[PDB]
Ligand binder design. Sequence first.
Ligand code: C2G
Ligand code: C2G
Ligand code: CA
Ligand code: CA
Ligand code: CA
Ligand code: CA
Lengths: 332, 341
Amino acid sequence: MRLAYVKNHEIYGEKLLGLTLRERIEKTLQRAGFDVRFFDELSLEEAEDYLIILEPVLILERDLLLEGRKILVSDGFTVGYFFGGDFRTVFDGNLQSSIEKYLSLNNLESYEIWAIKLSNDNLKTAEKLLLSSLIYDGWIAREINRKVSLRISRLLADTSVTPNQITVFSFFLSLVGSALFLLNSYLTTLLAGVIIQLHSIIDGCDGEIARLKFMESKYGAWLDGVLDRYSDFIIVFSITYVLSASNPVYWIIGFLAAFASLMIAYTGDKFVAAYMRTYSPEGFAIPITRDFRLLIIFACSVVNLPSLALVIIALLGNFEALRRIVALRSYT
Amino acid sequence: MRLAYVKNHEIYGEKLLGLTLRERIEKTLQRAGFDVRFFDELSLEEAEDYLIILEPVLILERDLLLEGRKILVSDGFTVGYFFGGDFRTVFDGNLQSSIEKYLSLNNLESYEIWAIKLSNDNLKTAEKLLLSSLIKAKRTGLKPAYYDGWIAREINRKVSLRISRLLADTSVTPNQITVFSFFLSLVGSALFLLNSYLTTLLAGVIIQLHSIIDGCDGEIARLKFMESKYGAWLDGVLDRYSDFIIVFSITYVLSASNPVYWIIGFLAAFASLMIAYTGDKFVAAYMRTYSPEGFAIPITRDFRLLIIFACSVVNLPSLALVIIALLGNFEALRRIVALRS
Ligand SMILES: Nc1ccn([C@@H]2O[C@H](COP(=O)(O)OP(=O)(O)OC[C@@H](O)CO)[C@@H](O)[C@H]2O)c(=O)n1
Ligand SMILES: Nc1ccn([C@@H]2O[C@H](COP(=O)(O)OP(=O)(O)OC[C@@H](O)CO)[C@@H](O)[C@H]2O)c(=O)n1
Ligand SMILES: [Ca+2]
Ligand SMILES: [Ca+2]
Ligand SMILES: [Ca+2]
Ligand SMILES: [Ca+2]
């Protein structure tokens, strides 16, 4: 058992993006495996480890790990103290003095963590930093979609909307786009592409809201990916069906595109299942991840050429999948 | 560091399915996280825990876990002793005497493990048992991505194990079998394209042959401790390619008669991937073996390929597409609904 002692401050009562800052630091520290104790005057309980936080701070780091006695720092500024259980043998009922004496008999190493010290002025700075802490994204995802999706999640933060609700809703948008494709006209094809790209953007909000409001879940991760598999398939299927009326050859291209869209996903998730680490190719890889796939569909749709999108997704998709098969034979 | 002390026996020099019983017990224990020391007379080194095996034994269990001092037992017979580090404070240079005293000062719980005590007579029995331990089941203690379906377990494994027994004496690697299994699916797919009952019959037969042999790569991997991360990755990926290409070939031929079969083909092809994806995504998210508790539609790969096989011999591959599309998609949707809880 580890205890995190956090001194109360009036600023902790302010809400930032759906939760009070008090709940945020409480939940963040609990994630790290610490029992949290807020205090004005400190009374020490027995525990294996102790975390002491005197100044009000917003922790932005996501996978905090504290093994071994250290001092927590953010840009030269001390955030908190991480002491061992032997701190019990020095504590005398007065906090600063006990810390002072304890620090004098020690020579503690510093440890950098992502956090921002809170003031009544920099709360806007804290929000932007907290939002930026929510973003394995492809280049299109990171540099385009996130810019919009974060602005949306910011607004969704103030609501009771759950990550799962966003996921299903995002899925529904992909259906609207697919439906618009079935109407077989440039206008509807254009509207289709726009909503597909919107779907691409909003599919980041489910994850953003999940991390922002500490509502991540195993089922959430599962459903998020699965419905993306359904969306990719249904989108490609819709585009192929309309095109098949003109040329039956598009069935073949359609098949190859749908398969590729699924395999880029499968190969990645299967890697995680087998290696138990995040998939991330070190060097060159053909940019045909989902953010690219939907942007390609969007772009080709605005010029009334969804068929060209299938060709690219089929080609770049299948080749990248094959590239991954050959590449992964290496380090394993 | 944890030390496993194994008393030497002449029988450990004998080869069982490609590896000596020495190599087998050594690797099994190494997998279990023990530094292994073979001995005639025992000199004790320091470690957190000690495992002592006096009688010659073949361990069949796959994911052995030893927490807390215990006595290891197989069907009433003592296999070995699992002592704590405090055994050092009792050891007097004589193994037999120290075991007696340590057991005297303690009250060890018995602990059942799957293993067979080895004799010069029961080696054929050891072989049969070792082969049966290669199956993806809960009885073996393996915690894989999936367990074997009913068709795989009750039909396919019976053949693939008999094949794996023969492959054990060769230099054939798991990856080589995986590629070969995939190539068979291509031969099956090609036969579908020739569009005749004879070739259609051969296609189905080879698809089921493919289904059976797709168990050999996994069997040989576990049998000779040649499991690998890429191996697990490749085994699954090529199965997806196979599922897609098989359905693709059948759909392409059928489309010449009625273009609507493209749709059924699509739905069948999609399902074949989703049954796989939903499971592996579970593994990725929950980090444990996927296993539905109650009702689930039997449309796993062993069934799908058997369905394709059966439908092909009656010259109705379209029916296989219909069955796979229907059973497959409802099962995928069922998994979406079931996992919410
Ligand atoms: N309803 C949800 C959705 C997501 N997550 C969590 O958020 C992670 C994914 O976050 P995303 O931002 O949605 O990432 P992704 O949608 O895969 O990519 C979208 C992004 O590239 C922009 O298009 C999942 O692993 C899951 O743990 C969750 O818990 N519940
Ligand atoms: N070249 C390979 C292939 C597989 N494996 C390992 O074997 C496991 C799968 O074993 P299989 O028995 O082959 O499982 P499966 O392919 O599902 O066989 C099912 C079969 O009955 C077909 O219906 C993989 O996860 C991997 O750990 C390996 O190490 N190397
Ligand atoms: Ca998402
Ligand atoms: Ca999604
Ligand atoms: Ca296999
Ligand atoms: Ca395979």
